[PDB]
Amino acid sequence: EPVYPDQLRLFSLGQGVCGDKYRPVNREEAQSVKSNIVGMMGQWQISGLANGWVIMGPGYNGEIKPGTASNTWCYPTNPVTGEIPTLSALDIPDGDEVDVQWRLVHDSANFIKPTSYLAHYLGYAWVGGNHSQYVGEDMDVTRDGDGWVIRGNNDGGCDGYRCGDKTAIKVSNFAYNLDPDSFKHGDVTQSDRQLVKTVVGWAVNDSDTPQSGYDVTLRGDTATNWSKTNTYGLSEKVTTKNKFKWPLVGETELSIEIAANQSWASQNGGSTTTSLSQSVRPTVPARSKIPVKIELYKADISYPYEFKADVSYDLTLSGFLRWGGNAWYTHPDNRPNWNHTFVIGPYKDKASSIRYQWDKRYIPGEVKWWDWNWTIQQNGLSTMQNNLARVLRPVRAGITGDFSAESQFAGNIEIGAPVPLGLRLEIPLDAQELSGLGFNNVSLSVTPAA
């Protein structure tokens, strides 16, 4: 009965019209998940709803009001019910890699219990230590190269058929993707925008024609010099998927690009040369000159910073599958030894994706791995939704350090009131002082706007 916004589909077939298998979303349903729908919309997008209503984009504040639209937000006549909720992220503060993983995989409520449950619901046998009669208790977490293994304790002996063969949950292949958008910074340790030099003068119009087609344009270059630290080692293994420019704090401007596919901890500063470029379209009255000034600045900035890195890992379940109750699509009854890897994080393929397999579980052709319906048959839709929501809970780790920059730049060429006496400049540029100041190859040139 809840509308799942991740199942909406937009059609462009004319007023109130959906493609085969879809039907228009109504004003009340769209109200119930309103921020999800708007967030799936373009700034000024206006899309239709049932029965003469439209929802508007974030630029209009996601307003729902009567109106007509040739494109319509639609919802399946046969939606997939019982989606797996997405829980709030679990944030792990910055530390060394081993310590960050440890806080993750040794957490009984958020990792050991959920994943052991998962094993157990799929029919994996013996998911717990010998010191508990409950699933995912008495579980030893031990290092395995760059990951970990969690497996019931095996001290002393046991009963049960093959009871010594505990199921293992191997956590490996951790990756950490830094999210630029998660940037945050503590108090500005140091800040100041300092007027270093002013370049001042005149542009004259020596002619009868009121000159006004020309750009006047500053050129030249300077440096941004920056550095950062990394408080812990996890930074050695952290990357960012796409390059981004270091974010703007306050009234400064830097040219720092962080690069993709390269250690966070191996990008600790350096000197990139920003570029001077300002232009200005002045209109100059009948044989008059105009005052012209360009302010040159240096700026320092420094603060502690925090980004968050999305942690992903592979979870491999290994053990035998029980006679007369397991969830492999072929329902083997011979207790074969099994190994399956689920990718916990960004999707890699169908076989390794609980979300895919679960969302498609009513499509017979798609069921080539686990039989999720069987697990619902066993435990109820509820229990599975909540277990899987926990298993899939997003994990982030804090990546921290101190940041520091200084850069130089030029303000906008500023233009004054025209006073009376193909445009001409009279704005002295002391190449040598500027160069001494750090402003190199500076040049002022006049050229046409068309």
Ligand X SMILES: O=P(O)(O)OC[C@H]1O[C@H](O)[C@@H](O)[C@@H](O)[C@@H]1O
Q: Which of 254, 275, 272 lies closest to 405 in space, CA to CA?
A: 254
The Cα–Cα gap between 270 and 251 comes to 21
Given the rule CB under 6 A, which of 57-65, 168-176, 300-308, 319-327 is the region that contacts ligand X? 319-327
- Compose the 278-317 pattern: x for residues touching ligand X by CB under 6 A, - for all others: ----------------------------------------
Q: How far is the CB of 43 from a second copy (least distance, A)?
A: 4
> Which residues precede a break in the chain, with C-to-N distance above 2.5 Å?
421
Cα 352 from chain centroid (whole Å)? 22
Q: How far is the CB of 351 from ligand X (least distance, A)?
A: 24
Given the rule CB under 6 A, which of 177-185, 237-245, 266-274, 322-330 is the region that contacts ligand X? 322-330
Residues 417-436 that bind ligand X (CB under 6 A): 417
The only residue of 359, 396, 434, 444 in contact with a second copy, by rule CB under 8 A: 359
Contact 56, 42 (CB under 8 A): no
CB nearer to ligand X: pick between 44 and 323: 323
Does the footprint of a second copy cover residue 58 (CB under 8 A)?
yes
Mutual angle of helices 113-121 and 372-391, in 10-degree steps:
170
The only residue of 44, 134, 323, 329 in contact with ligand X, by rule CB under 6 A: 323
CB nearer to ligand X: pick between 164 and 186: 164
Does the footprint of a second copy cover residue 250 (CB under 8 A)?
yes
The only residue of 11, 126, 176, 374 in contact with ligand X, by rule CB under 6 A: 126
Contact 358, 387 (CB under 8 A): no
Sign of CA dihedral 429, 431, 434, 438: positive
CB nearer to a second copy: pick between 85 and 270: 85
Does the footprint of ligand X cover residue 322 (CB under 6 A)?
yes
Does the footprint of a second copy cover residue 90 (CB under 8 A)?
yes
Percentages (nearest 5) of helix, strand, coil residues in the chain? 20, 40, 40
CB nearer to a second copy: pick between 1 and 349: 349
The Cα–Cα gap between 263 and 93 comes to 19
Give the C-alpha distances (Å, rounded to integers) separating 217 from 293, 411, 443. 12, 12, 8
Does the footprint of ligand X cover residue 160 (CB under 6 A)?
yes
The Cα–Cα gap between 180 and 320 comes to 43
The only residue of 68, 131, 155, 161 in contact with ligand X, by rule CB under 6 A: 161
User: Where would I find the beta strands (DSSP E) of 134-260?
Assistant: 139-144, 147-152, 168-185, 190-204, 214-221, 224-228, 238-239, 244-245, 257-258
- Compose the 315-354 pattern: x for residues touching a second copy by CB under 8 A, - for all others: -------------------------------xxx------
CB nearer to a second copy: pick between 35 and 435: 35
Residue ranges in contact with ligand X by CB under 6 A:
125-126, 160-161, 322-325, 335, 417
